[PDB]
Structure formats: structure tokens, C-alpha cells
Write a protein that holds these residues in place. Structure first.
Motif, PDB file in Angstrom:
ATOM      1  N   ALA A 163      95.374   9.543  -7.242  1.00  0.00           N
ATOM      2  CA  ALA A 163      96.923   9.171  -6.830  1.00  0.00           C
ATOM      3  C   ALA A 163      97.638   8.115  -7.400  1.00  0.00           C
ATOM      4  O   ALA A 163      99.038   7.988  -7.346  1.00  0.00           O
ATOM      5  N   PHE A 164      96.959   7.158  -7.970  1.00  0.00           N
ATOM      6  CA  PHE A 164      97.621   6.503  -9.090  1.00  0.00           C
ATOM      7  C   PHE A 164      98.726   6.970  -9.804  1.00  0.00           C
ATOM      8  O   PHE A 164      99.790   6.219  -9.866  1.00  0.00           O
ATOM      9  N   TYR A 165      98.516   8.048 -10.467  1.00  0.00           N
ATOM     10  CA  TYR A 165      99.391   8.848 -11.438  1.00  0.00           C
ATOM     11  C   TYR A 165     100.717   9.108 -10.501  1.00  0.00           C
ATOM     12  O   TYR A 165     101.855   9.178 -11.291  1.00  0.00           O
ATOM     13  N   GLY A 170     106.422   7.994  -9.111  1.00  0.00           N
ATOM     14  CA  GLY A 170     107.587   7.879  -7.709  1.00  0.00           C
ATOM     15  C   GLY A 170     107.311   9.403  -6.995  1.00  0.00           C
ATOM     16  O   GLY A 170     108.671   9.627  -6.507  1.00  0.00           O
ATOM     17  N   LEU A 171     106.271   9.713  -6.757  1.00  0.00           N
ATOM     18  CA  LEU A 171     105.945  10.741  -5.907  1.00  0.00           C
ATOM     19  C   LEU A 171     104.999  10.385  -4.961  1.00  0.00           C
ATOM     20  O   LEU A 171     104.032  11.347  -4.822  1.00  0.00           O
ATOM     21  N   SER A 172     105.030   9.162  -4.570  1.00  0.00           N
ATOM     22  CA  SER A 172     103.843   8.868  -3.489  1.00  0.00           C
ATOM     23  C   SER A 172     103.692   9.857  -2.251  1.00  0.00           C
ATOM     24  O   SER A 172     102.689   9.787  -1.410  1.00  0.00           O
ATOM     25  N   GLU A 173     104.828  10.313  -1.853  1.00  0.00           N
ATOM     26  CA  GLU A 173     104.748  11.124  -0.663  1.00  0.00           C
ATOM     27  C   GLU A 173     103.892  12.586  -1.148  1.00  0.00           C
ATOM     28  O   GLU A 173     103.410  13.006  -0.146  1.00  0.00           O
ATOM     29  N   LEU A 174     103.732  12.847  -2.354  1.00  0.00           N
ATOM     30  CA  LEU A 174     102.929  13.846  -2.709  1.00  0.00           C
ATOM     31  C   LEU A 174     101.664  13.469  -2.913  1.00  0.00           C
ATOM     32  O   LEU A 174     100.782  14.534  -3.020  1.00  0.00           O
ATOM     33  N   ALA A 175     100.980  12.287  -2.728  1.00  0.00           N
ATOM     34  CA  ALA A 175      99.894  11.793  -2.922  1.00  0.00           C
ATOM     35  C   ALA A 175      99.354  11.122  -1.883  1.00  0.00           C
ATOM     36  O   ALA A 175      99.028   9.916  -2.154  1.00  0.00           O
ATOM     37  N   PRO A 176      99.156  11.662  -0.716  1.00  0.00           N
ATOM     38  CA  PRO A 176      98.740  10.937   0.428  1.00  0.00           C
ATOM     39  C   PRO A 176      97.215  10.841   0.531  1.00  0.00           C
ATOM     40  O   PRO A 176      96.672  10.205   1.738  1.00  0.00           O
ATOM     41  N   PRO A 178      93.425   9.925  -2.025  1.00  0.00           N
ATOM     42  CA  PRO A 178      93.013   9.358  -3.064  1.00  0.00           C
ATOM     43  C   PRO A 178      93.102  10.147  -4.524  1.00  0.00           C
ATOM     44  O   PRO A 178      93.389   9.707  -5.453  1.00  0.00           O
ATOM     45  N   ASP A 179      92.751  11.388  -4.251  1.00  0.00           N
ATOM     46  CA  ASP A 179      92.622  12.377  -5.393  1.00  0.00           C
ATOM     47  C   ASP A 179      93.444  13.581  -4.927  1.00  0.00           C
ATOM     48  O   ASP A 179      93.277  14.009  -3.661  1.00  0.00           O
ATOM     49  N   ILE A 180      94.150  14.217  -5.871  1.00  0.00           N
ATOM     50  CA  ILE A 180      95.080  15.104  -5.622  1.00  0.00           C
ATOM     51  C   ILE A 180      95.073  16.492  -6.492  1.00  0.00           C
ATOM     52  O   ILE A 180      95.053  16.183  -7.956  1.00  0.00           O
ATOM     53  N   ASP A 181      94.865  17.522  -6.095  1.00  0.00           N
ATOM     54  CA  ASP A 181      94.985  18.879  -7.231  1.00  0.00           C
ATOM     55  C   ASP A 181      96.568  18.898  -7.571  1.00  0.00           C
ATOM     56  O   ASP A 181      97.331  19.183  -6.731  1.00  0.00           O
ATOM     57  N   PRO A 182      96.599  18.836  -8.607  1.00  0.00           N
ATOM     58  CA  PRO A 182      98.218  18.929  -9.197  1.00  0.00           C
ATOM     59  C   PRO A 182      98.716  20.473  -9.152  1.00  0.00           C
ATOM     60  O   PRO A 182      99.729  20.665  -9.044  1.00  0.00           O
ATOM     61  N   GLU A 183      97.830  21.299  -9.253  1.00  0.00           N
ATOM     62  CA  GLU A 183      98.026  22.557  -8.757  1.00  0.00           C
ATOM     63  C   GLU A 183      98.474  23.121  -7.360  1.00  0.00           C
ATOM     64  O   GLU A 183      99.212  23.798  -7.273  1.00  0.00           O
ATOM     65  N   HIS A 184      97.821  22.245  -6.583  1.00  0.00           N
ATOM     66  CA  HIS A 184      98.195  22.403  -5.306  1.00  0.00           C
ATOM     67  C   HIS A 184      99.695  21.977  -4.833  1.00  0.00           C
ATOM     68  O   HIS A 184     100.322  22.321  -4.033  1.00  0.00           O
ATOM     69  N   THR A 185      99.845  20.763  -5.548  1.00  0.00           N
ATOM     70  CA  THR A 185     101.301  20.153  -5.471  1.00  0.00           C
ATOM     71  C   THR A 185     102.402  21.053  -6.139  1.00  0.00           C
ATOM     72  O   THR A 185     103.356  21.190  -5.189  1.00  0.00           O
ATOM     73  N   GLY A 186     102.175  21.532  -7.281  1.00  0.00           N
ATOM     74  CA  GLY A 186     103.168  22.271  -7.730  1.00  0.00           C
ATOM     75  C   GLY A 186     103.458  23.619  -6.833  1.00  0.00           C
ATOM     76  O   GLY A 186     104.709  23.813  -6.504  1.00  0.00           O
ATOM     77  N   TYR A 188     103.146  23.366  -3.817  1.00  0.00           N
ATOM     78  CA  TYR A 188     103.498  23.050  -2.436  1.00  0.00           C
ATOM     79  C   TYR A 188     105.092  22.984  -2.439  1.00  0.00           C
ATOM     80  O   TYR A 188     105.673  23.066  -1.475  1.00  0.00           O
ATOM     81  N   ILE A 189     105.722  22.316  -3.491  1.00  0.00           N
ATOM     82  CA  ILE A 189     106.885  22.139  -3.770  1.00  0.00           C
ATOM     83  C   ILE A 189     108.107  23.151  -4.132  1.00  0.00           C
ATOM     84  O   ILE A 189     108.985  23.332  -4.013  1.00  0.00           O
ATOM     85  N   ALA A 190     107.281  23.999  -4.778  1.00  0.00           N
ATOM     86  CA  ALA A 190     107.967  25.451  -5.366  1.00  0.00           C
ATOM     87  C   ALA A 190     108.256  26.225  -4.224  1.00  0.00           C
ATOM     88  O   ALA A 190     107.859  26.086  -2.975  1.00  0.00           O
ATOM     89  N   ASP A 191     109.285  27.021  -4.366  1.00  0.00           N
ATOM     90  CA  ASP A 191     109.977  27.630  -3.459  1.00  0.00           C
ATOM     91  C   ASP A 191     109.240  29.136  -3.164  1.00  0.00           C
ATOM     92  O   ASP A 191     109.234  29.897  -2.189  1.00  0.00           O
ATOM     93  N   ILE A 192     108.836  29.624  -4.474  1.00  0.00           N
ATOM     94  CA  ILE A 192     107.994  30.835  -4.522  1.00  0.00           C
ATOM     95  C   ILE A 192     107.050  30.383  -5.789  1.00  0.00           C
ATOM     96  O   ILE A 192     107.576  29.790  -6.705  1.00  0.00           O
TER      97      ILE A 192
END
Length: 440
Positions: A163-165, A170-176, A178-186, A188-192
Motif C-alpha cells: 500500500a506504500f506505493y 496520492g491514491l490512499s483511497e484505493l489502498a485500504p 496492506p497489500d493491493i492487487d493493482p489489476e483489481h484497482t484498474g 475497479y476505477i474503469a467504467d468498462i
């Protein structure tokens, strides 16, 4: 307003090859530009270009001079962005932590550059970002400029980031967590969200199911103008007879494999075992194998071993020209693609496009590309079943394969980058069909 402005984020773009992603993104961009859409591309320079500095940003508590190299060809506007880590030549990062920091950087640099162009341009209609590496750029552009966003995944790398990263981004809202799948984030924010074949979507549904309703697929293409028989000369037999003797081999049904020798990926292991299985059947004498590529020392050894004990079988680990590979696809009879998994299946399209019949694993996109009329699908990871499939292929060469080859060419041409571009356009507006959990 049929015309639109697409901002495309890719972490590698031609001339900076590593896999095919470079070639793939360059093609989408160009196909897109050809439909009359205005296409802007942001990609890092990787220290292959040096740019004008345009501004300094703070990242990981330290200032960095963001540079840019601009290139324009028709509607396509290509923006190569240098800076701190973005100058590093090791594309996929100076090590793990290096890669992530370069991605985070690329995010903030992407904001800065977009922000400067907005001094004199309208906002683009959509931000189309590719693979997890560009998530920091996408998420930031989406969070600040609030424009439509599409996330294309060319392959699931399937891991997590501290989550450090995301805090530094400046995306702390996206890293609630300790560890985050950045593919799930992508996603999650995309519209499709898109991936690259229908079958890979089915295969990896356990993950893609998270975006049920906003998740679809958009096929890659092939440029069948380059992979085209017009470049060759002679009949198929003449080219094949000739190529077979270039390898001290006389005439037979010729199968080929092109790909990296690696562990649970491209399946050369499955082919080598499958050849052992065939090496003692009667009909083996009638067949020829050309195995191209390198990587794993043990598999190379196994390959050379089979080569030593059969003049029937030739191996090639030196890399070769597109032009000679084109020659190969155009002479051989079949192309074996024993992949364990496969997001799309470009090799099948390049072969098909020059007349070679695919014998392929029933995985990911190969399932979509290949049909009863065009090739032979096989259960993956199964050398007995690939052996059976090579034998069936032999009993076909009895009769004219002319039909199968023409079917293949036609089929390969239907997989154009134009069509690919066309559907992404539908995806950009959300006017697209998608996968849902309650639709069977």
C-alpha cells in the motif's frame, strides 16, 4: 460527434519491443487513428529518447525533471515521457521495487503532461489504459479529470503491491489494505473493462467476475498485409522441398513450433514428449519437425537430444528475421501451438495468414481463433492427445489441404485491427455487450 479524442496509456510502445505488447498497442493506436479519431499516446521513453524538460514533479519525496519526446503521424500523436526512473532502460523496471516506482512516476508525469496540453486543448473523451503498469496513470487521470476510462488487460500478472506505493501516488483511497492487487484497482476505477479474447475471459472468469456487468472482451488483430504470400515465390511444395533440404531433410509432412522454451507457458515440453510418443509409431518416418526458439537449458538439452537421435527433427535457437519466419509459415504444413494458457494467440494468426494449419491447445484465445474449418484443438498439457492430433493431421495430407489453408487465410483476415479498433470505440462510450454472472 462520431469523431473522438482517445488518450492511450501503454507502458511499452514501438520502437520499444519487449513482448508483442509494444506491437499490439502501436497497431490499435494506428488502426484507431485511421478511423479518423484523434489518438494521443503516453508511454515512457525508457532512455531510448531524450526529451525537452517541461517541468519538475515531486515523487517519493524528491523532485524529478520530467522530459518529453513528441512524434506525430497523422491523427496519432505519440508522447514519450522521460524523467527519473522513466529514463531506465530495463523496461520492466530496475528490479521489482524499481518497476513500481517507475509506474508511480509515470502516473504523476502523465498528469503533468496532460495538464499542460489542456492549456490549449480540450479534454480527451476517454483514457484507455493497458495492463497494471499504467494503473497509477489511469487512476490519477480518472480521479482528477473525471473522464471515461477503459482498462484493457493483455494478461493477468496476478500479484499484489504494498500500500506504500499507492500512498506515494496520492491514491490512499484505493489502498485500504496492506497489500493491493493493482489489476483489481484498474478494473475497479474503469467504467468498462476489456481483455483480449473471449476464451481468456472465460478461463480467468474467477477474477474477471469481479467486474461482472462492466467486463467484456475485444480481440487483438493481425496485419495480414505483412504476413502475406505475395512476398514469396514458388508453389508451396517448391518452397517446402527447398526449405527441407536447407536442413538436410527430404520431403515429408512438416510441423513447426515457434516460441520460447519455458516451464508452464508455451508448451514445448508437451511437444517434446509428444514426439517421443510418436518416434516409435510406423508413421513417424513420414513426418518432419522444426522446433524454433530458446530459453530453458533443460528443454534445449531435451530438444538437441531428440535432434541428435533423429535426422527427422531439426532445432533452431538462434533468432531469425521476420522475413525468414514468414518464409517458414508459408512452407510448413502445420504449426503446433501447445500452449498451457494463451490470452490471444498471435502465432496462430500469423501462421493461418500464410496458409499453415494450426494444431493448438484449447486455451484462451486459441479457442476463438481456431475452428473445425481452420484447425485442430487439443486438450492442453496432454502429450498423448497432441500425438493423436499429429497423426490425424497426417491422414489429411493424404487429400488436399488446399481448402483448410484458404479457410485459414480468410479467417485470419477477419481478425483485423480495424475491427478491433471499432469495438474499442463502442467500449469507450459503454455501448457494448458485456459478461454478467446471471447470463449463461
Amino acid at each position: 460527434g462520431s469523431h473522438m479524442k482517445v488518450l492511450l496509456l501503454g507502458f511499452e510502445f514501438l520502437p520499444v519491443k519487449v513482448g508483442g505488447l509494444a506491437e499490439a498497442l502501436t497497431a490499435i493506436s494506428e488502426a484507431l487513428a485511421s478511423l479518423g479519431h484523434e489518438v494521443l499516446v503516453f508511454t515512457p521513453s525508457h532512455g531510448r529518447f531524450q526529451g525537452e524538460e517541461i517541468g519538475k514533479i515531486r515523487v517519493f519525496g524528491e523532485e524529478v525533471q520530467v522530459k518529453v519526446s513528441y512524434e506525430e503521424r497523422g491523427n496519432l500523436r505519440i508522447y514519450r515521457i522521460g524523467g527519473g526512473l522513466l529514463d531506465s532502460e530495463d523496461v520492466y523496471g530496475p528490479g521489482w521495487d524499481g518497476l513500481i516506482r517507475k509506474a508511480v512516476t509515470f502516473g504523476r508525469a502523465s498528469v503533468l503532461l496532460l495538464n499542460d496540453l489542456l492549456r490549449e486543448e480540450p479534454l480527451p473523451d476517454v483514457v484507455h489504459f493497458h495492463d497494471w503498469h499504467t494503473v497509477f496513470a489511469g487512476a490519477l487521470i480518472k480521479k482528477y479529470f473525471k473522464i471515461p476510462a477503459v482498462f484493457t488487460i493483455h494478461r493477468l500478472n496476478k500479484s499484489k503491491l504494498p500500500a506504500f506505493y499507492f500512498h506515494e501516488a496520492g491514491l490512499s483511497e484505493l489502498a485500504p489494505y496492506p497489500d493491493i492487487d493493482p489489476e483489481h484497482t484498474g478494473g475497479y476505477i474503469a467504467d468498462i473493462v476489456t481483455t483480449v479474447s473471449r476464451g481468456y475471459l472465460i478461463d480467468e472468469w474467477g477474477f474477471f467476475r469481479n467486474f461482472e456487468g462492466k467486463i467484456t472482451y475485444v480481440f487483438n488483430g493481425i496485419d495480414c498485409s505483412f504476413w502475406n504470400e505475395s512476398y514469396l515465390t514458388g508453389s508451396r511444395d517448391e518452397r517446402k522441398k527447398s526449405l527441407l533440404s536447407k536442413f538436410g531433410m527430404d520431403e515429408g509432412v512438416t510441423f513447426m513450433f515457434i516460441g520460447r522454451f519455458d516451464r508452464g507457458q508455451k508448451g514445448v515440453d508437451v511437444l517434446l514428449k509428444a514426439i517421443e510418443i510418436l518416434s516409435s509409431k510406423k508413421e513417424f518416418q513420414e513426418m518432419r519437425f522444426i522446433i524454433i526458439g530458446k530459453g530453458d537449458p533443460e528443454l534445449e538439452g531435451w530438444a538437441r537430444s531428440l535432434e541428435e537421435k533423429h535426422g527427422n527433427v531439426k532445432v533452431i535457437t538462434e533468432m531469425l528475421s521476420r522475413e525468414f519466419v514468414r518464409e517458414l509459415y508459408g512452407s510448413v504444413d502445420f504449426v503446433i501451438i501447445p500452449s498451457y494458457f494463451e490470452p490471444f494467440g498471435l502465432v496462430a494468426l500469423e501462421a493461418m495468414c500464410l496458409g499453415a494449419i494450426p494444431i493448438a491447445s484449447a486455451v484462451g484465445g486459441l479457442r476463438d481463433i481456431i475452428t473445425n474449418e481452420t484447425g485442430i484443438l487439443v486438450k492442453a498439457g496432454d502429450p498423448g492427445e497432441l500425438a493423436n492430433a499429429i497423426l490425424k493431421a497426417l491422414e489429411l495430407s493424404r487429400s488436399d489441404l488446399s481448402k483448410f489453408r484458404e479457410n485459414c487465410k480468410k479467417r485470419a483476415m477477419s481478425f483485423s485491427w480495424e475491427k478491433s479498433a471499432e469495438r474499442y470505440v463502442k467500449a469507450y462510450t459503454g455501448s457494448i455487450d458485456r459478461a454478467f454472472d446471471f447470463i449463461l
